Design a protein around this ligand. Structure first.
Ligand SMILES: COc1ccccc1O[C@@H]1O[C@H](CO)[C@H](O)[C@H](O)[C@H]1O
Length: 150
């Protein structure tokens, strides 16, 4: 099982930065959408649904540092969860070698967000089908490319 970010080199586990464009200006009523399907894709390393991968997001996934006070929602694979995540999400099954963009969106409710700032840490868990399933942990550190004001 492997993923990449913005079509980059393969990732089998660990923490990776994911850079996103955010609305440069917001008013207190406005909530920011962060469509992570535009950046993260994963695939089965055999294809053919032979040793199928099972992926979910993990309890404890949350906003980072400054935004710990923020509220939001996390859309994952047909369900919209409160964010930060207080439970593990449903499982997405990955069996094709053709990359699947992750069905993952984050909704977030002067300068409030800095470019280069980690705004959320999303923990993802993988376990396959054969043997022990060779479980792996991924963390996606979501970082804004730009300032967001007000
Ligand atoms: C990059 O690693 C691989 C390269 C080539 C073929 C298989 C590879 O890893 C296996 O992939 C499987 C299907 O995704 C399952 O995820 C196994 O658990 C994992 O060991």
């Amino acid at each position: 099982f492997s993923c990449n970010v913005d079509g980059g080199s393969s990732i089998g586990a660990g923490t990776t930065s994911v850079y996103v464009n955010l609305d440069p200006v917001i008013q207190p009523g406005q909530n920011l959408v962060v469509d992570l399907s535009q950046h993260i894709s994963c695939w089965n390393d055999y294809g053919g649904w032979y040793d199928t991968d099972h992926i979910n997001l993990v309890q404890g996934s949350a906003f980072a540092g400054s935004l710990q006070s923020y509220k939001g929602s996390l859309y994952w694979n047909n369900v919209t969860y409160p964010f930060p995540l207080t439970t593990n999400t449903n499982v997405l099954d990955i069996g094709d070698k053709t990359p699947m963009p992750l069905p993952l969106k984050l909704y977030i409710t002067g300068v409030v967000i800095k470019a280069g700032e980690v705004i959320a840490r999303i923990h993802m868990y993988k376990i396959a089908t054969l043997g022990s399933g060779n479980p792996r942990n991924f963390t996606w550190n979501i970082i804004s490319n730009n300032s967001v004001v007000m």
